[PDB]
Design a protein around this ligand. Structure first.
Ligand SMILES: CCN(CC)CCCNc1ncc2cc(-c3cc(OC)cc(OC)c3)c(NC(=O)NC(C)(C)C)nc2n1
Length: 294
């Protein structure tokens, strides 16, 4: 059984379980009644993490460890925050903030410019549009979340648009910050090794500097509007591209300044990469000078 932490405990009758969000344990959408003591009468839409039917002892241990890690890291606007937990007299439920617009990759792709007669999906026409200032603002918010996590001594190890969630208010929130098959693909069929720093991939050295490399790939994802890094590149060819010092091309509609930022994040020497603190400062300055007119 689990011990009661009254800092986070929410009674079971206060959580109304809803539709599944996905399946790593399962996550469902829910409504929490009286999450805050003012008001005990207000419902808040939340995401709830719980274990699947065939859950092992280590699966439960990992869920507990992730919840424990979130309590220790504390609160920030640009991370998925812990809101509560149902630990007593039933299955463990970990309650976190809800991001109604899904992950950053989905959010960017759904807001791509309309489809033309040469496009894969010519019928694509979103009722939602992103200016150049909006894309730099996304990168600023993610850098801010990462700067906070780094100040808390947290190394993400899988920073990518898939692990950034977007709220109803377009706030970027870093996800899965408190959690190794190189050939294993994601839910969307992409290879996570494509976000890894060379020293993380070849020497298994994970630092804030290796997360900055990943953030460089995340920036390329923002400016390609959810583009796929190295499409058609298998793991062994990726390794060779990295050993050769190859770097991804400059996306179109991306300033020389922002491509230089990407390239700086991808410095071969980890110590020479900008820190998250420098990236937040450079991004804050760039946001203010970036046109929202297109
Ligand atoms: C239905 C609308 N749709 C829009 C396209 C989808 C909206 C999806 N929103 C949404 N919000 C908040 C969520 C929070 C966590 C979440 C993040 C955490 O980080 C710290 C920790 C956590 O537990 C401890 C849960 C989460 N983790 C998942 O593993 N999820 C799947 C299985 C879908 C990949 N998934 C969320 N998903």
């Amino acid at each position: 059984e689990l011990p009661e932490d009254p800092r986070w405990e929410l009674p079971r009758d206060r959580l109304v379980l809803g539709k599944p969000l996905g399946e790593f344990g399962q996550v469902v959408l829910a409504e929490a009644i009286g999450l805050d003591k003012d008001k005990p009468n207000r419902v808040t839409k939340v995401a709830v993490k719980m274990l699947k039917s065939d859950a092992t002892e280590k699966d439960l241990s990992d869920l507990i460890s992730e919840m424990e890690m979130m309590k220790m890291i504390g609160k920030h606007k640009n991370i998925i925050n812990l809101l509560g937990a149902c630990t007593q007299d039933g299955p463990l439920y970990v309650i976190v903030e809800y991001a109604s617009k899904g992950n950053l990759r989905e959010y960017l792709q759904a807001r791509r410019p309309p489809g033309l007669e040469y496009s894969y999906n010519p019928s694509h026409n979103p009722e939602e549009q992103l200016s150049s200032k909006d894309l730099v603002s996304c990168a600023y918010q993610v850098a801010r979340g990462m700067e906070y996590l780094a100040s808390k001594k947290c190394i993400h190890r899988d920073l990518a648009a898939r692990n950034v969630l977007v709220t109803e208010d377009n706030v970027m929130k870093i996800a899965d910050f408190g959690l190794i098959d190189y050939y294993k693909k994601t839910t969307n069929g992409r290879l996570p090794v494509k976000w890894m720093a060379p020293e993380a991939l070849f020497d298994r050295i994970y630092t804030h500097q290796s997360d900055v490399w990943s953030f460089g790939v995340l920036l390329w994802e923002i400016f390609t509007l959810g583009g796929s890094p190295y499409p058609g590149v298998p793991v062994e060819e990726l390794f060779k591209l990295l050993k050769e010092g190859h770097r991804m091309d400059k996306p179109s509609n991306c300033t020389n300044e922002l491509y230089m930022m990407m390239r700086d994040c991808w410095h071969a020497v980890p110590s020479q990469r900008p820190t998250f603190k420098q990236l937040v400062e450079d991004l804050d300055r760039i946001v203010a000078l970036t046109s929202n007119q297109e």
